[PDB]
Design a protein around this nucleic acid. Structure first.
Lengths: 149, 46, 271, 77
RNA sequence: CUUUAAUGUUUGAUGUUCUAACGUUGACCCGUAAUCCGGGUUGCGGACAGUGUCUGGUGGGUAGUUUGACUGGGGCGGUC
RNA sequence: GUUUAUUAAAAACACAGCACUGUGCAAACACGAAAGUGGACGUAUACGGUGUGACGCCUGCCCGGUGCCGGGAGGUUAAU
RNA sequence: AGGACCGAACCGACUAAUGUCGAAAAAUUAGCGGAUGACUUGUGGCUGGGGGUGAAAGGCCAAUCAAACCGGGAGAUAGCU
């Protein structure tokens, strides 16, 4: 399927290139998320007219805003006190709900889907590293030290 | 010697009554056929 | 206790009874009861879908709490009761907050025993905890397929499962059938073994005993005519055919599991 | 029923012929599936029971155009 | 041409990971005094399962049929 | 105890018990073009199928053939 | 306590005789089995024909069952009377 790309696709993203893609890939991922628009002999003239450069800056500022946001908290440290068990066996596994809420209350205002946990769900008690992706090409590292209560 | 026919008004009406026929389309066709034949008694009427 | 009754008359000679002196001698707890209309093996189409079902004593349904979601509330075992719907006895438990509930009774329970749920619970039998907090190698019962589903394994009298290994977020359990199944660590389980382990020692004695238990007579395929069963026909007990189900499927050693969806959670099969 | 909501494909009866040309009545079924399509005009997902051919039709045309035709057909989606 | 090897091409089998199709007879909220159904949030599986078209195997579970004539009755045997 | 209402009440059928086999729960299986329902508001000390038929002594040898279960060296093998 | 014992109602039908254009399209008379249970019964529901139901006889499904009844294809076909 010949489609025009808006966002930077890591593999074949080139700002509106007539590059074939699987129908399922565009149908289920690109179009619903706004990363591309189906163009068939009608929007090509339109893309090169108003999408050619007008939205290029609009897309870029989103990346610039994301880069600004992820540096809001220079400390980049998260401390949460949990009533862990006796010698391990933390009370209960916690994912993104509590940590995101605490960070939002005091720290960086970020959405739920932004937080990614590469080291499980924080089972063991101690120091852990969490990779935050506010953009495809922007990755952030945050150290979390859960302390037993 | 118990015989096949053991009368019961409630069972007769609820089985072959007018409203029983109208419930289904097959019963409605039964009434339609008997109207065409001109039968005086459309169904078993109490 | 197992008691052998004297052969005062035929039908009592082979009766072996199981008597539990601590079972409650009275009516059950009404608020937790519900009517249980029999079906006789018929489905919504009115046809017989399961054979050899019908009749039997009327029995009410006890709402047994399998989920065990009352976290952090200590509870006390009021009494043990006979449940007609289950092989295992149930226990009526009163929570500190004034709520009564029914739970499966493990082997160790007795009147006045203390039980607790939630992760912040002890290791004594009757307490329910997520399987992540349960030490490996312990015996549990009433295990959950999925978090919050309720509990489906080791529910009969004298049944249990073994926790053998814990990898990542999944746990491996050995079921009473000798099969190893992989379950999520978030699922809850109850420590200990289901009680009434002597329930398997009864023999029912006579034909009427199975009759008022809801079971109807079973007719052998050979006794039937060819038009009714794949077996049957001929003079003088002729078989000359491979055993098969009434609908033609080959029984006596043919595997019928065709799921391809839950196979990822099966580590070993029965042997 | 097994009717595609886009192309209108419905099961069609037919024959199946053996080597001996024996004819037995069969039925051809459309390749229907339940799919959720994202519509930007109304900003939500719409579930349609559409065939594989219909899904190709939706891709070639616009989802908005197909929805308009469905509305003109007089059947709720 | 026989004998071998750097980058790029078609690639297909296998393996790992991901989520956005799809499944959910998991939980929670709403329509709603509702164990149906739908929508929403989340969890778990996940391109698997399942379904359509085509195709190999199995298939008395079911169906339609066939199973000759002569003959010192017929059958058996023999013959055509 | 049940059975050929209306020529067969029995040694037939059932039976408690016994064994084999299938089934991990969206269970096997059954009725349904499907939804769905029974199994079961049960889950392996449970459920379905099959044979034998209380109880006591027991139940020997044979895997060639046909089924069923497992294997993969090699050969043959459809659609495409 | 008991699918315990004897025995009426009640349920069933082992033997004999009568009756076979009968009082009766399976009965009567005299005996006979069970009779607190796998019992029996009233009322009302559910299962529909290649289907149901069946402690299994090819039994029963309105006096009809190795495929009910009614209408239709249909004036089926009949090398036979």
């Amino acid at each position: 399927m010949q489609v025009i790309l808006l966002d930077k696709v890591a593999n074949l993203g080139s700002l509106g290139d007539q590059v074939n893609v699987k129908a399922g890939y565009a149908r289920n991922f690109l179009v619903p998320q706004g990363k591309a628009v189906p163009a068939t002999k009608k929007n090509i003239e339109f893309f090169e007219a108003r999408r050619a450069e007008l939205e290029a800056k609009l897309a870029e500022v989103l990346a610039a805003a994301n880069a600004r946001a992820e540096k809001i908290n220079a400390l980049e440290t998260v401390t949460i006190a949990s009533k862990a068990g006796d010698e391990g066996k933390l009370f209960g596994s916690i994912g993104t709900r509590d940590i995101a809420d605490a960070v939002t209350a005091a720290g960086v205002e970020v959405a739920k889907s932004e937080v990614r946990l590469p080291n499980g769900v924080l089972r063991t008690t101690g120091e852990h590293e969490v990779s935050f992706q506010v953009h495809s090409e922007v990755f952030a590292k945050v150290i979390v030290n859960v302390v037993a209560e | 010697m118990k015989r096949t026919f053991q009368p019961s008004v409630l069972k007769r009406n609820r089985s072959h009554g007018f409203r029983a026929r109208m419930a289904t389309k097959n019963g409605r066709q039964v009434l339609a056929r008997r109207r065409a034949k001109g039968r005086a008694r459309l169904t078993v009427s109490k | 206790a197992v008691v052998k009754c004297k052969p005062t008359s035929p039908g009592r000679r082979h009766v072996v009874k199981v008597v539990n002196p601590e079972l409650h001698k009275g009516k059950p707890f009404a608020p937790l009861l519900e009517k249980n209309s029999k079906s006789g093996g018929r489905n919504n189409n009115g046809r017989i879908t399961t054979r050899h079902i019908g009749g039997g004593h009327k029995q009410a349904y006890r709402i047994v709490d399998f989920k065990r979601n009352k976290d952090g509330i200590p509870a006390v075992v009021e009494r043990l009761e006979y449940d007609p719907n289950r092989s295992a006895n149930i226990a009526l438990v009163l929570y500190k907050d004034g709520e009564r509930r029914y739970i499966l009774a493990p082997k160790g329970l007795k009147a006045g025993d203390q039980i607790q749920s939630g992760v912040d619970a002890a290791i004594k039998p009757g307490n329910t905890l997520p399987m992540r907090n349960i030490p490996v190698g312990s015996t549990v019962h009433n295990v959950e397929m999925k978090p919050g589903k309720g509990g489906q394994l080791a529910r009969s009298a004298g049944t249990y499962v073994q926790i053998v290994a814990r990898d990542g977020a999944y746990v491996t359990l050995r079921l009473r059938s000798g099969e190893m199944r992989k379950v999520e660590a978030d699922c809850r389980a109850t420590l200990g073994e289901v009680g009434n382990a002597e329930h398997m020692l009864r023999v029912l004695g006579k034909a009427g005993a199975a009759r008022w238990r809801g079971v109807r007579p079973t007719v052998r395929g050979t006794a039937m005519n060819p038009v009714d069963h794949p077996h049957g026909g001929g003079e003088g007990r002729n078989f000359g055919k491979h055993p098969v189900t009434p609908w033609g499927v080959q029984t006596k050693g043919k595997k019928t599991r065709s799921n391809k969806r839950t196979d990822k959670f099966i580590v070993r099969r029965r042997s | 029923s097994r009717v595609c909501q886009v192309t209108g494909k419905r099961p069609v009866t037919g024959n199946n012929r053996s080597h001996a040309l024996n004819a037995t009545k069969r039925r051809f079924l459309p390749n229907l599936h339940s799919h959720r399509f994202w519509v930007e005009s109304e900003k939500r997902f719409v579930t349609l029971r559409v065939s594989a051919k219909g899904m190709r039709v939706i891709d070639k045309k616009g989802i908005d155009t197909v929805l308009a035709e469905l509305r003109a057909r007089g059947e709720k989606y």
